Design a binder for this molecule. Sequence first.
Ligand SMILES: CCCOc1ccc(CN)cc1Cl
Ligand SMILES: CCCOc1ccc(CN)cc1Cl
Ligand SMILES: CCCOc1ccc(CN)cc1Cl
Ligand SMILES: CCCOc1ccc(CN)cc1Cl
Length: 327
Amino acid sequence: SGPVPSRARVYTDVNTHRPSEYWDYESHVVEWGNQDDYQLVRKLGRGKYSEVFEAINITNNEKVVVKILKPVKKKKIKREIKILENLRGGPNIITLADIVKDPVSRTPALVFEHVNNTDFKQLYQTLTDYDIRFYMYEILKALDYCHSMGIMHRDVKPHNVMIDHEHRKLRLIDWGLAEFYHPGQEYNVRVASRYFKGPELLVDYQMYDYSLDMWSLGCMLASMIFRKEPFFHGHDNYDQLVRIAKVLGTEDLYDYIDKYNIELDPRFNDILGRHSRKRWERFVHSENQHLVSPEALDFLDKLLRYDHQSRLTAREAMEHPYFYTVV
Ligand SMILES: CCCOc1ccc(CN)cc1Cl
Ligand SMILES: CCCOc1ccc(CN)cc1Cl
Ligand SMILES: CCCOc1ccc(CN)cc1Cl
Ligand SMILES: CCCOc1ccc(CN)cc1Cl
């Protein structure tokens, strides 16, 4: 009979009702500018798909961020460009400012707005309960916006969240794995970083949606409020589901597999075992109790659910009592 189909509970048909120009990235015309307007300043980081640099726009002495793209399918570069162009100016979304190529190497490069990621290690003040609520709300604004625009980020994790704490500014970056949501489409499950992969990815359920980002956000919330990084510490993709099952329990996992008629990989036979569903209160310790509250655990419980359909949407999350105190 095969797996039972699924579709997003929200923003289901936003790409369906838009003209193809919006979501047909393969047909998008990229106009590559000239990289001489920029001087590279320093190396910011290295990724699987890119090298990120701090730079100066020499025409106006303004700091920019330059992402030089590593060898990848032309289709993937076009997808990222089109998504960034569609989301440009959205709340807490990194802003694409220019698309350039070095006249000699012809290597593709994306130019973005500068974001000054705070060195948190050099602050007397440690993370507070209010800080978590404030920045979790800013991420949600970004996710509700991109989901409303028919886009799944698919790589929500701390390294893809830039925070300028002095200006209380947050930006969701690296749209390289992002994809347009089309109801009924079967997606590649080899997305997201291991610790942040949703159970749908781990059981190879391809008909996933925006709710994938909500699981990733829940992993980030658990790691912050409990001071346990990462929260689900798998050593491989199969072991990752086992770490999740040791907290959410095996009974709800079998209800999830049964509901969607999911074919479970035989590699899971000898490793899943039997696990009770743990209370979230059991992760509270003297070192994290200032970040934990009944509201925070109720909110966490509503994100970290096997059933992608039963997770809060980004808009439902924004209305949770956990955020009543945020501006
Ligand atoms: C007007 C709806 C078009 O539907 C799609 C567009 C693009 C894709 C990805 N190849 C899939 C679908 Cl169903
Ligand atoms: C809730 C506040 C902590 O969250 C962060 C702090 C710094 C960074 C830098 N990538 C990212 C996150 Cl999510
Ligand atoms: C530990 C492996 C068990 O495998 C399964 C468990 C539950 C279901 C749903 N009837 C299916 C499988 Cl293969
Ligand atoms: C915002 C006030 C606190 O909210 C709660 C208190 C208790 C529970 C259940 N133990 C849930 C919530 Cl949201």
